[PDB]
Each structure stands twice: as structure tokens, then as C-alpha cells.
Amino acid sequence: GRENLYFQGHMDVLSVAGPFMRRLMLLSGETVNVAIRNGNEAVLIGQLECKSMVRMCAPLGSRLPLHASGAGKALLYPLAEEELMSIILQTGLQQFTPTTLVDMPTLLKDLEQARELGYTVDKEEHVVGLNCIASAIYDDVGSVVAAISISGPSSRLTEDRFVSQGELVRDTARDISTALGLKA
């Protein structure tokens, strides 16, 4: 079912996300990605690149770590601690950069913060020089079905912009969730 990469629910998120991905790319100036959970990794299924020659440009289908990428963490923060414990038992907490979160308590502390703010921040935890800011997309029952993120060079998506961009990503995710809920 939803464990299939081509699951219709995933495609439904893509079908309504277009307009919002466009607005987010324009307002943030960075590449916008849509990821879903598959095989205990975050897989990029939608993307809209920004126009800058230097940017994030992983291909669709790229598989990202759930505990170390912004997109991955956005798929994790809505989950109950028991499910999180289950996932990590199987994936482990591979270190990708010098600051990756590789301990369960720090990871949980970070996800609790993202749940309070409605967005997560990945500051070079996956790829050196790449910051990712992401937020969960939810279905009619409040379950997380996907995540949207802006990803770009750490020198451009700087710390002084995390709050303004985080709120824009959260609002964007919120609108996608709403659009997904419409019966057209």
C-alpha cells in the first residue's frame, strides 16, 4: 500500500502541491522538495529547483536519511516516540557530517522542538554546506503523509532567515494539507 513508492496517496500530494511549490521557491529563493517515507528513508518524489546556478539539485528518487535531513525529520516529528524507537532500532543513527544527530535523546529533543514550531531545521547534518528547512504534510485524519522542504547553500539560507523561512515552509505545508483534503 502506502509502502509502495508509487502509492496513489503520494501522487495525490504531488498533484495538488504544484502551485504551492512554485510560491515557496519564489519566496525562499531555494530548491523546493517533496518527500515521502519509504524503506525507512525519505525519498524525493517532487522537486522544483530555484533559478540560481548554485543550489541544491539532488535528483528525484534520491534516498535521504530520516534522522539527518530536514525532509526526513519532518516525516519523523509527528510520530509517536514508540514508532520513532522502532524506526531507529532498524536504521541506526549513521553519522553523515560532524554535526549529525547520532544520539536518540538529542534527536528526540530536536523533533520535539520541530513539533512545537511546525517546522524542522537541518543545518549541515546531512551534507556539509546544505541547510534544509521542512514541515509535515498531513491527511484528513491528522497523520503525516509527506514533507515539503526548501534546501540550499548554508551561506544563502543563513541562520537569521530560519524563523521567517520556517514559518513560510510551515504555512506552505499547511496549504498543501488543505488542498489535499479537497474532493475535486
Swiss-Prot record:
It comes from the Bacteria. Keywords: DNA-binding, Repressor, Transcription, Transcription regulation. One of its GO terms (cellular component) is cytosol. Changing residue 57 to W: Strongly reduced repressor activity. Reduces DNA binding. Prevents assembly into functionally active tetramers. Changing residue 151 to A/M: Slightly reduced repressor activity. Loss of glyoxylate-triggered dissociation from DNA. One of its GO terms (biological process) is negative regulation of DNA-templated transcription. Glyoxylate binds at residues 69-71, 122, 132, 149-151. Residues 13-182 form the IclR-ED domain. One of its GO terms (molecular function) is identical protein binding. Homotetramer and homodimer. Homotetramer in its active, DNA-bound form. Homodimer in its inactive form. Negative regulator of allantoin and glyoxylate utilization operons. Binds to the gcl promoter and to the allS-allA intergenic region. Binding to DNA is abolished by glyoxylate. This is HTH-type transcriptional repressor AllR. It comes from Escherichia coli (strain K12). The chain holds residues 97 to 269 of 271 of the full protein.
